[PDB]
Amino acid sequence: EQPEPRTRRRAYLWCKEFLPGAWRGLREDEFHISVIRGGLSNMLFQCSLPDTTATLGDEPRKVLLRLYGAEAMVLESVMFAILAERSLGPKLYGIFPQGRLEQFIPSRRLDTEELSLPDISAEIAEKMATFHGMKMPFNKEPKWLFGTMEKYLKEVLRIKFTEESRIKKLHKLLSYNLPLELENLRSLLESTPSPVVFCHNDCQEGNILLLEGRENSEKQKLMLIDFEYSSYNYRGFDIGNHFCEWMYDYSYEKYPFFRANIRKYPTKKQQLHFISSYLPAFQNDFENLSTEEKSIIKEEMLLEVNRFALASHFLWGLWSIVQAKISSIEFGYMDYAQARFDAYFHQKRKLGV
Ligand SMILES: CN(C)c1cc[n+](Cc2ccc(-c3ccccc3)cc2)cc1
């Protein structure tokens, strides 16, 4: 797909002015661009040199253009630049009011089923442990989790839908008495020790790259991307959120445009495999501990992450209701909220909370 003529010309100018080497001498009529993701906001394009133009230094031959569309920008930009310097995320080539030029990384995204592959899960754990070791210049108070759940709750209780099915669905969702349940959840998570770390906060399969050519490689075949929700937070949340994502498939091509399967949440066996990879990646002298000491740490982690997984359901369930009101993307947001709340109570029953 080709962009609007206007966009082609703005993109040409950004590449010409922000990129070194052959980009500086490029003629408009040899500039290549294609739409990766359309929409009104956060549009993605691939921009590239012609095959007939040689690289003059180490300028990239292909780049990703991200267009914003329609304080948060300061923090997002700084975070992205820092992660790029530290080689955790894609390189940053250009920043401007309308968007960014980022490294283009040949890859495809993982699907839901691939999250359960032992080899894949172990590397996700290592990548997340590496991400959790980042020191960042942002607020280190863990206010994000309940701060955000409270804000969303307030928004949800003020929604006035007009469409009949959404009115009905919301009435069912609010019938549980969410303020009390949120404060019971707050109570439980307060008594659940969990270190505050820099978390991704959105570790779903759609945010993990399987790097081109590395498919048959043992380690180092993945990259975590899309950091826009990252913040200091309880470690249990990041891991528990990721576990939740085993159950949801966003590639269903018919309404409600997702599939939920409770039976696909990781077994305790599968969780153990994941945390056994996470721990030595997070605390490097971990392997030097006695089998007994490692076992205690692992057991306590299992309880931590499964309690925090409840906050993933509660948060994204509320989030989804808000989206049903304010979004414009075709997706069964109310049905999705119901699925998250269904899982909240199912898991709560199983915990004995
Ligand atoms: C805002 N944030 C970090 C979230 C929000 C929602 N979720 C779960 C979720 C993921 C994808 C979707 C979705 C929405 C529209 C189209 C395809 C997938 C919905 C909910 C995870 C993290």
mmCIF file of C-alpha atoms and ligand atoms in Angstrom:
data_model
loop_
_atom_site.group_PDB
_atom_site.id
_atom_site.type_symbol
_atom_site.label_atom_id
_atom_site.label_comp_id
_atom_site.label_asym_id
_atom_site.label_seq_id
_atom_site.Cartn_x
_atom_site.Cartn_y
_atom_site.Cartn_z
ATOM 1 C CA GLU A 1 0.000 0.000 0.000
ATOM 2 C CA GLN A 2 1.170 3.531 -0.832
ATOM 3 C CA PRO A 3 0.614 6.543 1.466
ATOM 4 C CA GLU A 4 -1.158 9.781 0.502
ATOM 5 C CA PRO A 5 1.061 11.934 -1.778
ATOM 6 C CA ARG A 6 1.354 14.480 1.074
ATOM 7 C CA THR A 7 2.661 11.820 3.456
ATOM 8 C CA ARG A 8 5.120 10.518 0.889
ATOM 9 C CA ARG A 9 6.590 13.988 0.585
ATOM 10 C CA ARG A 10 6.794 14.669 4.348
ATOM 11 C CA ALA A 11 8.448 11.254 4.851
ATOM 12 C CA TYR A 12 10.964 11.929 2.075
ATOM 13 C CA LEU A 13 11.932 15.184 3.799
ATOM 14 C CA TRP A 14 12.302 13.613 7.237
ATOM 15 C CA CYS A 15 14.540 10.824 5.869
ATOM 16 C CA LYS A 16 16.570 13.250 3.727
ATOM 17 C CA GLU A 17 17.183 15.607 6.654
ATOM 18 C CA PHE A 18 17.585 13.204 9.648
ATOM 19 C CA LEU A 19 19.529 10.340 8.027
ATOM 20 C CA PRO A 20 23.242 10.529 7.020
ATOM 21 C CA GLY A 21 25.047 9.263 3.877
ATOM 22 C CA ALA A 22 23.113 8.318 0.758
ATOM 23 C CA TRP A 23 19.885 9.688 2.247
ATOM 24 C CA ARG A 24 21.160 13.270 1.937
ATOM 25 C CA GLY A 25 21.564 12.953 -1.868
ATOM 26 C CA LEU A 26 18.402 10.963 -2.541
ATOM 27 C CA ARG A 27 16.019 12.293 -5.204
ATOM 28 C CA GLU A 28 12.299 12.248 -4.380
ATOM 29 C CA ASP A 29 11.610 10.126 -7.432
ATOM 30 C CA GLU A 30 13.744 7.238 -6.112
ATOM 31 C CA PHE A 31 12.471 7.272 -2.523
ATOM 32 C CA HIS A 32 10.530 4.127 -1.568
ATOM 33 C CA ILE A 33 7.792 4.036 1.028
ATOM 34 C CA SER A 34 4.985 1.641 1.912
ATOM 35 C CA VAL A 35 2.288 1.635 4.584
ATOM 36 C CA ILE A 36 2.806 -1.006 7.264
ATOM 37 C CA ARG A 37 -0.012 0.243 9.495
ATOM 38 C CA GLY A 38 -2.717 2.744 8.569
ATOM 39 C CA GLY A 39 -5.289 4.486 10.747
ATOM 40 C CA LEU A 40 -5.720 7.942 12.248
ATOM 41 C CA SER A 41 -3.041 7.660 14.918
ATOM 42 C CA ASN A 42 0.277 5.802 15.382
ATOM 43 C CA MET A 43 0.630 5.075 11.633
ATOM 44 C CA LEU A 44 3.710 3.023 10.647
ATOM 45 C CA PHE A 45 5.641 3.168 7.335
ATOM 46 C CA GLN A 46 8.692 1.469 5.839
ATOM 47 C CA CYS A 47 11.071 3.925 4.077
ATOM 48 C CA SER A 48 13.988 2.743 1.961
ATOM 49 C CA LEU A 49 16.820 3.563 -0.426
ATOM 50 C CA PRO A 50 16.598 2.278 -4.013
ATOM 51 C CA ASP A 51 18.647 -0.825 -4.708
ATOM 52 C CA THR A 52 20.633 1.323 -7.174
ATOM 53 C CA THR A 53 21.874 3.665 -4.393
ATOM 54 C CA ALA A 54 24.999 2.564 -2.484
ATOM 55 C CA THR A 55 25.500 3.136 1.258
ATOM 56 C CA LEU A 56 28.232 5.733 1.883
ATOM 57 C CA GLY A 57 28.867 5.013 5.574
ATOM 58 C CA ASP A 58 26.806 2.965 7.997
ATOM 59 C CA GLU A 59 23.465 4.672 7.368
ATOM 60 C CA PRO A 60 20.586 2.177 7.341
ATOM 61 C CA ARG A 61 19.095 1.189 3.957
ATOM 62 C CA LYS A 62 15.600 0.820 5.433
ATOM 63 C CA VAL A 63 13.922 2.601 8.361
ATOM 64 C CA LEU A 64 10.579 2.666 10.206
ATOM 65 C CA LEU A 65 8.623 5.891 10.231
ATOM 66 C CA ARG A 66 6.096 6.210 13.089
ATOM 67 C CA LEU A 67 3.543 8.988 12.837
ATOM 68 C CA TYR A 68 1.722 10.075 15.989
ATOM 69 C CA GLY A 69 -1.547 11.164 14.381
ATOM 70 C CA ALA A 70 -4.046 12.453 16.955
ATOM 71 C CA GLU A 71 4.611 15.560 29.324
ATOM 72 C CA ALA A 72 3.694 12.027 28.159
ATOM 73 C CA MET A 73 5.603 12.627 24.887
ATOM 74 C CA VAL A 74 8.707 13.849 26.784
ATOM 75 C CA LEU A 75 8.811 10.688 28.929
ATOM 76 C CA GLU A 76 7.988 8.336 26.069
ATOM 77 C CA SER A 77 10.741 9.885 23.901
ATOM 78 C CA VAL A 78 13.380 9.823 26.643
ATOM 79 C CA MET A 79 12.521 6.236 27.523
ATOM 80 C CA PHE A 80 12.786 5.147 23.865
ATOM 81 C CA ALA A 81 16.159 6.950 23.447
ATOM 82 C CA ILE A 82 17.572 5.348 26.606
ATOM 83 C CA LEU A 83 16.420 1.841 25.640
ATOM 84 C CA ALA A 84 18.027 2.391 22.192
ATOM 85 C CA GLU A 85 21.399 3.439 23.704
ATOM 86 C CA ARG A 86 21.394 0.349 25.914
ATOM 87 C CA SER A 87 20.590 -1.879 22.866
ATOM 88 C CA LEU A 88 17.339 -3.116 24.403
ATOM 89 C CA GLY A 89 15.053 -1.518 21.828
ATOM 90 C CA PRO A 90 15.340 -0.438 18.162
ATOM 91 C CA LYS A 91 17.787 2.342 17.391
ATOM 92 C CA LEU A 92 16.453 5.919 17.332
ATOM 93 C CA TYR A 93 17.356 7.767 14.075
ATOM 94 C CA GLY A 94 15.129 10.855 14.304
ATOM 95 C CA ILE A 95 12.732 12.661 16.579
ATOM 96 C CA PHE A 96 10.353 15.452 15.503
ATOM 97 C CA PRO A 97 6.952 16.844 16.602
ATOM 98 C CA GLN A 98 4.938 14.589 14.250
ATOM 99 C CA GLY A 99 6.788 11.318 14.860
ATOM 100 C CA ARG A 100 10.001 9.279 14.990
ATOM 101 C CA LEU A 101 12.421 7.443 12.648
ATOM 102 C CA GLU A 102 13.347 4.106 14.235
ATOM 103 C CA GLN A 103 15.457 1.118 13.209
ATOM 104 C CA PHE A 104 13.556 -1.358 11.002
ATOM 105 C CA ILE A 105 13.965 -4.908 12.420
ATOM 106 C CA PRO A 106 13.086 -7.746 10.004
ATOM 107 C CA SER A 107 10.790 -9.943 12.066
ATOM 108 C CA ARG A 108 7.270 -11.213 12.589
ATOM 109 C CA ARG A 109 5.239 -11.071 15.802
ATOM 110 C CA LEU A 110 4.634 -14.201 17.887
ATOM 111 C CA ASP A 111 1.137 -15.779 17.955
ATOM 112 C CA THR A 112 -0.611 -16.799 21.179
ATOM 113 C CA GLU A 113 0.273 -20.525 20.890
ATOM 114 C CA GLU A 114 3.998 -19.790 20.577
ATOM 115 C CA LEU A 115 4.055 -18.277 24.108
ATOM 116 C CA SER A 116 3.795 -21.817 25.541
ATOM 117 C CA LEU A 117 6.818 -23.156 23.648
ATOM 118 C CA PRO A 118 9.449 -23.976 26.359
ATOM 119 C CA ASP A 119 12.275 -22.368 24.397
ATOM 120 C CA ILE A 120 10.196 -19.231 23.649
ATOM 121 C CA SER A 121 8.910 -18.876 27.229
ATOM 122 C CA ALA A 122 12.453 -19.181 28.683
ATOM 123 C CA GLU A 123 13.688 -16.356 26.444
ATOM 124 C CA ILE A 124 10.659 -14.123 27.187
ATOM 125 C CA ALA A 125 11.560 -14.610 30.891
ATOM 126 C CA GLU A 126 15.181 -13.614 30.292
ATOM 127 C CA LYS A 127 14.168 -10.567 28.198
ATOM 128 C CA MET A 128 11.750 -9.433 30.919
ATOM 129 C CA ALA A 129 14.324 -9.953 33.651
ATOM 130 C CA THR A 130 16.756 -7.786 31.586
ATOM 131 C CA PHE A 131 14.095 -5.131 31.140
ATOM 132 C CA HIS A 132 13.434 -5.212 34.944
ATOM 133 C CA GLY A 133 17.083 -4.431 35.651
ATOM 134 C CA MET A 134 16.860 -1.042 33.845
ATOM 135 C CA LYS A 135 17.353 2.107 35.911
ATOM 136 C CA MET A 136 15.257 4.853 34.415
ATOM 137 C CA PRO A 137 14.813 8.505 35.347
ATOM 138 C CA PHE A 138 11.095 8.211 36.154
ATOM 139 C CA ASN A 139 9.009 8.135 39.334
ATOM 140 C CA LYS A 140 9.837 4.967 41.310
ATOM 141 C CA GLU A 141 6.762 5.014 43.532
ATOM 142 C CA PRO A 142 4.556 2.081 42.477
ATOM 143 C CA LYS A 143 1.485 4.282 42.091
ATOM 144 C CA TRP A 144 0.777 3.293 38.486
ATOM 145 C CA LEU A 145 -1.137 0.076 39.122
ATOM 146 C CA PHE A 146 -3.865 1.194 41.502
ATOM 147 C CA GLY A 147 -3.589 4.798 40.380
ATOM 148 C CA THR A 148 -4.583 3.620 36.935
ATOM 149 C CA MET A 149 -7.246 1.134 38.112
ATOM 150 C CA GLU A 150 -8.850 3.886 40.261
ATOM 151 C CA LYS A 151 -8.861 6.366 37.371
ATOM 152 C CA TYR A 152 -10.447 3.819 35.027
ATOM 153 C CA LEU A 153 -13.048 2.842 37.629
ATOM 154 C CA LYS A 154 -14.107 6.475 38.033
ATOM 155 C CA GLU A 155 -14.373 6.787 34.247
ATOM 156 C CA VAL A 156 -16.395 3.568 33.910
ATOM 157 C CA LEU A 157 -18.975 4.592 36.575
ATOM 158 C CA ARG A 158 -19.558 7.840 34.625
ATOM 159 C CA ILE A 159 -20.060 6.259 31.209
ATOM 160 C CA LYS A 160 -23.443 6.768 29.647
ATOM 161 C CA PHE A 161 -23.779 4.416 26.695
ATOM 162 C CA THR A 162 -26.621 4.888 24.239
ATOM 163 C CA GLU A 163 -26.594 1.527 22.450
ATOM 164 C CA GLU A 164 -28.828 -1.120 24.002
ATOM 165 C CA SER A 165 -26.379 -4.071 24.163
ATOM 166 C CA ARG A 166 -23.609 -1.965 25.746
ATOM 167 C CA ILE A 167 -26.013 -0.535 28.381
ATOM 168 C CA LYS A 168 -26.968 -4.121 29.302
ATOM 169 C CA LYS A 169 -23.411 -5.409 29.363
ATOM 170 C CA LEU A 170 -22.203 -2.552 31.551
ATOM 171 C CA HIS A 171 -25.038 -3.094 34.020
ATOM 172 C CA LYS A 172 -23.915 -6.685 34.411
ATOM 173 C CA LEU A 173 -20.254 -5.590 34.845
ATOM 174 C CA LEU A 174 -21.117 -2.954 37.491
ATOM 175 C CA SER A 175 -23.419 -5.325 39.426
ATOM 176 C CA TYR A 176 -20.374 -6.957 41.050
ATOM 177 C CA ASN A 177 -19.709 -3.791 43.162
ATOM 178 C CA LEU A 178 -16.345 -2.865 41.677
ATOM 179 C CA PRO A 179 -15.271 -0.278 44.286
ATOM 180 C CA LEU A 180 -15.416 -2.930 47.047
ATOM 181 C CA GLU A 181 -13.726 -5.544 44.853
ATOM 182 C CA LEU A 182 -10.980 -3.077 43.873
ATOM 183 C CA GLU A 183 -10.326 -2.345 47.574
ATOM 184 C CA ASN A 184 -10.298 -6.064 48.435
ATOM 185 C CA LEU A 185 -7.757 -6.505 45.616
ATOM 186 C CA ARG A 186 -5.736 -3.544 46.996
ATOM 187 C CA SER A 187 -5.833 -5.215 50.418
ATOM 188 C CA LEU A 188 -4.575 -8.571 49.056
ATOM 189 C CA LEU A 189 -1.808 -7.098 46.876
ATOM 190 C CA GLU A 190 -0.572 -4.898 49.820
ATOM 191 C CA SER A 191 0.204 -8.070 51.796
ATOM 192 C CA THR A 192 1.930 -9.639 48.776
ATOM 193 C CA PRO A 193 5.617 -8.683 48.631
ATOM 194 C CA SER A 194 6.849 -7.891 45.108
ATOM 195 C CA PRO A 195 9.868 -5.742 44.135
ATOM 196 C CA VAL A 196 9.189 -2.502 42.278
ATOM 197 C CA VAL A 197 11.046 -2.606 38.942
ATOM 198 C CA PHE A 198 10.839 -0.984 35.541
ATOM 199 C CA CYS A 199 8.035 -3.046 33.883
ATOM 200 C CA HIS A 200 6.949 -3.309 30.267
ATOM 201 C CA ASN A 201 3.311 -3.610 31.383
ATOM 202 C CA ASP A 202 2.136 -5.016 28.030
ATOM 203 C CA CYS A 203 4.039 -8.268 27.365
ATOM 204 C CA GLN A 204 1.575 -9.843 24.871
ATOM 205 C CA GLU A 205 2.596 -11.884 21.799
ATOM 206 C CA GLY A 206 1.808 -8.859 19.508
ATOM 207 C CA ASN A 207 4.624 -6.965 21.246
ATOM 208 C CA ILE A 208 7.315 -9.636 20.914
ATOM 209 C CA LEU A 209 9.399 -9.951 17.742
ATOM 210 C CA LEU A 210 10.688 -13.258 16.396
ATOM 211 C CA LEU A 211 13.837 -12.000 14.691
ATOM 212 C CA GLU A 212 14.278 -12.927 11.026
ATOM 213 C CA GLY A 213 16.901 -15.638 10.455
ATOM 214 C CA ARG A 214 17.119 -16.489 14.202
ATOM 215 C CA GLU A 215 14.111 -18.904 14.208
ATOM 216 C CA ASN A 216 16.277 -21.998 14.577
ATOM 217 C CA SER A 217 18.626 -20.366 17.075
ATOM 218 C CA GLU A 218 18.539 -21.582 20.690
ATOM 219 C CA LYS A 219 18.651 -18.277 22.522
ATOM 220 C CA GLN A 220 18.520 -14.630 21.454
ATOM 221 C CA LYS A 221 15.702 -14.945 18.910
ATOM 222 C CA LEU A 222 13.271 -12.415 20.429
ATOM 223 C CA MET A 223 12.908 -8.666 21.082
ATOM 224 C CA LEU A 224 10.351 -6.988 23.329
ATOM 225 C CA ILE A 225 8.920 -3.895 21.635
ATOM 226 C CA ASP A 226 6.165 -1.240 22.168
ATOM 227 C CA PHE A 227 7.092 0.435 25.439
ATOM 228 C CA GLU A 228 4.420 3.102 25.548
ATOM 229 C CA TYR A 229 2.884 1.711 28.751
ATOM 230 C CA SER A 230 6.149 0.996 30.569
ATOM 231 C CA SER A 231 6.564 2.373 34.103
ATOM 232 C CA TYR A 232 7.918 1.442 37.515
ATOM 233 C CA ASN A 233 5.486 -1.132 38.884
ATOM 234 C CA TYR A 234 5.253 -4.351 40.870
ATOM 235 C CA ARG A 235 7.259 -7.102 39.193
ATOM 236 C CA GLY A 236 4.419 -9.549 39.907
ATOM 237 C CA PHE A 237 2.211 -7.509 37.594
ATOM 238 C CA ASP A 238 4.506 -7.770 34.559
ATOM 239 C CA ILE A 239 4.880 -11.532 34.920
ATOM 240 C CA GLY A 240 1.244 -12.154 35.895
ATOM 241 C CA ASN A 241 0.070 -9.978 33.017
ATOM 242 C CA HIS A 242 2.187 -12.009 30.631
ATOM 243 C CA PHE A 243 0.732 -15.226 31.998
ATOM 244 C CA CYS A 244 -2.739 -13.835 31.413
ATOM 245 C CA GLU A 245 -1.842 -13.279 27.731
ATOM 246 C CA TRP A 246 -1.512 -17.037 27.141
ATOM 247 C CA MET A 247 -5.321 -17.141 27.336
ATOM 248 C CA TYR A 248 -6.214 -14.459 24.751
ATOM 249 C CA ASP A 249 -5.886 -14.621 20.991
ATOM 250 C CA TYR A 250 -6.342 -11.317 19.126
ATOM 251 C CA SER A 251 -6.286 -12.879 15.613
ATOM 252 C CA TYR A 252 -9.879 -14.181 15.536
ATOM 253 C CA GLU A 253 -11.140 -12.711 12.272
ATOM 254 C CA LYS A 254 -14.831 -12.668 13.285
ATOM 255 C CA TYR A 255 -16.750 -10.758 16.010
ATOM 256 C CA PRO A 256 -15.872 -10.259 18.901
ATOM 257 C CA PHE A 257 -12.394 -10.427 17.236
ATOM 258 C CA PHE A 258 -10.728 -12.330 20.075
ATOM 259 C CA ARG A 259 -10.755 -15.816 21.581
ATOM 260 C CA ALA A 260 -10.436 -16.561 25.309
ATOM 261 C CA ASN A 261 -9.484 -19.951 26.700
ATOM 262 C CA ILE A 262 -9.022 -20.325 30.474
ATOM 263 C CA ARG A 263 -7.477 -23.785 29.967
ATOM 264 C CA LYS A 264 -4.475 -22.212 28.240
ATOM 265 C CA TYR A 265 -3.266 -20.240 31.309
ATOM 266 C CA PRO A 266 0.178 -21.720 32.147
ATOM 267 C CA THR A 267 0.153 -24.762 34.467
ATOM 268 C CA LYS A 268 2.281 -24.530 37.603
ATOM 269 C CA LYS A 269 4.833 -26.660 35.711
ATOM 270 C CA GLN A 270 4.919 -24.104 32.884
ATOM 271 C CA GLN A 271 5.162 -21.181 35.339
ATOM 272 C CA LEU A 272 8.061 -22.842 37.097
ATOM 273 C CA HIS A 273 9.883 -23.190 33.773
ATOM 274 C CA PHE A 274 9.411 -19.484 33.102
ATOM 275 C CA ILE A 275 10.498 -18.326 36.549
ATOM 276 C CA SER A 276 13.532 -20.698 36.501
ATOM 277 C CA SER A 277 14.716 -18.719 33.474
ATOM 278 C CA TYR A 278 13.749 -15.310 34.896
ATOM 279 C CA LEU A 279 15.527 -15.612 38.242
ATOM 280 C CA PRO A 280 19.105 -16.246 37.101
ATOM 281 C CA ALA A 281 18.660 -13.552 34.454
ATOM 282 C CA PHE A 282 17.506 -11.114 37.195
ATOM 283 C CA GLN A 283 19.850 -12.077 40.085
ATOM 284 C CA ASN A 284 22.976 -13.518 38.410
ATOM 285 C CA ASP A 285 24.426 -15.428 41.454
ATOM 286 C CA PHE A 286 21.044 -17.210 41.687
ATOM 287 C CA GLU A 287 22.548 -20.512 40.368
ATOM 288 C CA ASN A 288 24.985 -20.513 43.302
ATOM 289 C CA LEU A 289 22.133 -20.805 45.830
ATOM 290 C CA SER A 290 21.309 -24.236 47.308
ATOM 291 C CA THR A 291 18.445 -26.252 45.716
ATOM 292 C CA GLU A 292 16.530 -25.592 48.964
ATOM 293 C CA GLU A 293 16.934 -21.783 48.854
ATOM 294 C CA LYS A 294 16.003 -21.552 45.142
ATOM 295 C CA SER A 295 12.904 -23.649 45.842
ATOM 296 C CA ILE A 296 11.652 -21.159 48.500
ATOM 297 C CA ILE A 297 12.206 -18.194 46.186
ATOM 298 C CA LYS A 298 10.367 -20.016 43.360
ATOM 299 C CA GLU A 299 7.408 -20.989 45.569
ATOM 300 C CA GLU A 300 6.981 -17.456 46.859
ATOM 301 C CA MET A 301 7.212 -16.140 43.286
ATOM 302 C CA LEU A 302 4.462 -18.517 42.125
ATOM 303 C CA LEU A 303 2.118 -17.032 44.780
ATOM 304 C CA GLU A 304 3.240 -13.432 43.951
ATOM 305 C CA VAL A 305 2.652 -13.672 40.206
ATOM 306 C CA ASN A 306 -0.685 -15.451 40.419
ATOM 307 C CA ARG A 307 -2.069 -12.884 42.865
ATOM 308 C CA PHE A 308 -0.879 -10.034 40.641
ATOM 309 C CA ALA A 309 -2.416 -11.731 37.572
ATOM 310 C CA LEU A 310 -5.778 -10.764 39.167
ATOM 311 C CA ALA A 311 -4.749 -7.110 38.737
ATOM 312 C CA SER A 312 -4.145 -7.757 35.026
ATOM 313 C CA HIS A 313 -7.758 -8.933 34.667
ATOM 314 C CA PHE A 314 -9.177 -6.091 36.723
ATOM 315 C CA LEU A 315 -7.124 -3.390 35.023
ATOM 316 C CA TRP A 316 -7.588 -4.437 31.375
ATOM 317 C CA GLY A 317 -11.219 -5.341 32.024
ATOM 318 C CA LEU A 318 -11.863 -1.751 33.149
ATOM 319 C CA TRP A 319 -9.658 -0.430 30.367
ATOM 320 C CA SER A 320 -11.732 -2.312 27.820
ATOM 321 C CA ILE A 321 -15.003 -0.770 29.073
ATOM 322 C CA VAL A 322 -13.467 2.697 28.637
ATOM 323 C CA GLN A 323 -12.430 1.701 25.100
ATOM 324 C CA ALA A 324 -15.969 0.532 24.259
ATOM 325 C CA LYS A 325 -16.963 4.151 25.002
ATOM 326 C CA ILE A 326 -14.041 6.124 23.501
ATOM 327 C CA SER A 327 -12.386 3.900 20.853
ATOM 328 C CA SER A 328 -13.046 3.745 17.081
ATOM 329 C CA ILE A 329 -11.376 0.385 16.290
ATOM 330 C CA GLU A 330 -13.569 -2.629 15.409
ATOM 331 C CA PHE A 331 -13.302 -5.014 18.408
ATOM 332 C CA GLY A 332 -15.701 -6.565 20.944
ATOM 333 C CA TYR A 333 -14.528 -4.447 23.920
ATOM 334 C CA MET A 334 -17.536 -5.145 26.189
ATOM 335 C CA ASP A 335 -17.352 -8.896 25.545
ATOM 336 C CA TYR A 336 -13.623 -8.674 26.229
ATOM 337 C CA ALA A 337 -14.226 -6.877 29.548
ATOM 338 C CA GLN A 338 -16.658 -9.665 30.498
ATOM 339 C CA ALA A 339 -13.990 -12.272 29.625
ATOM 340 C CA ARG A 340 -11.436 -10.559 31.826
ATOM 341 C CA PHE A 341 -13.885 -10.330 34.758
ATOM 342 C CA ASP A 342 -14.904 -13.983 34.236
ATOM 343 C CA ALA A 343 -11.229 -14.907 34.555
ATOM 344 C CA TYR A 344 -10.757 -12.609 37.579
ATOM 345 C CA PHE A 345 -13.354 -14.513 39.618
ATOM 346 C CA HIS A 346 -12.267 -17.944 38.320
ATOM 347 C CA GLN A 347 -8.672 -17.332 39.355
ATOM 348 C CA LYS A 348 -9.766 -15.790 42.666
ATOM 349 C CA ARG A 349 -11.775 -18.976 43.444
ATOM 350 C CA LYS A 350 -8.709 -21.131 42.617
ATOM 351 C CA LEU A 351 -6.460 -18.984 44.850
ATOM 352 C CA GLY A 352 -8.930 -19.334 47.724
ATOM 353 C CA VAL A 353 -8.983 -15.546 48.162
HETATM 354 C C1 LIG B 1 -3.271 -0.538 27.620
HETATM 355 N N1 LIG B 1 -2.558 -1.812 27.846
HETATM 356 C C2 LIG B 1 -1.137 -1.823 28.249
HETATM 357 C C3 LIG B 1 -3.193 -2.965 27.569
HETATM 358 C C4 LIG B 1 -4.536 -2.926 27.192
HETATM 359 C C5 LIG B 1 -5.193 -4.107 26.872
HETATM 360 N N2 LIG B 1 -4.539 -5.360 26.943
HETATM 361 C C6 LIG B 1 -5.289 -6.591 26.566
HETATM 362 C C7 LIG B 1 -5.690 -6.363 25.237
HETATM 363 C C8 LIG B 1 -4.777 -6.505 24.189
HETATM 364 C C9 LIG B 1 -5.189 -6.241 22.874
HETATM 365 C C10 LIG B 1 -6.502 -5.809 22.608
HETATM 366 C C11 LIG B 1 -6.903 -5.535 21.292
HETATM 367 C C12 LIG B 1 -7.699 -4.413 21.029
HETATM 368 C C13 LIG B 1 -8.103 -4.114 19.729
HETATM 369 C C14 LIG B 1 -7.695 -4.938 18.674
HETATM 370 C C15 LIG B 1 -6.896 -6.056 18.928
HETATM 371 C C16 LIG B 1 -6.499 -6.360 20.234
HETATM 372 C C17 LIG B 1 -7.404 -5.654 23.663
HETATM 373 C C18 LIG B 1 -6.987 -5.921 24.968
HETATM 374 C C19 LIG B 1 -3.186 -5.403 27.307
HETATM 375 C C20 LIG B 1 -2.533 -4.203 27.614
#
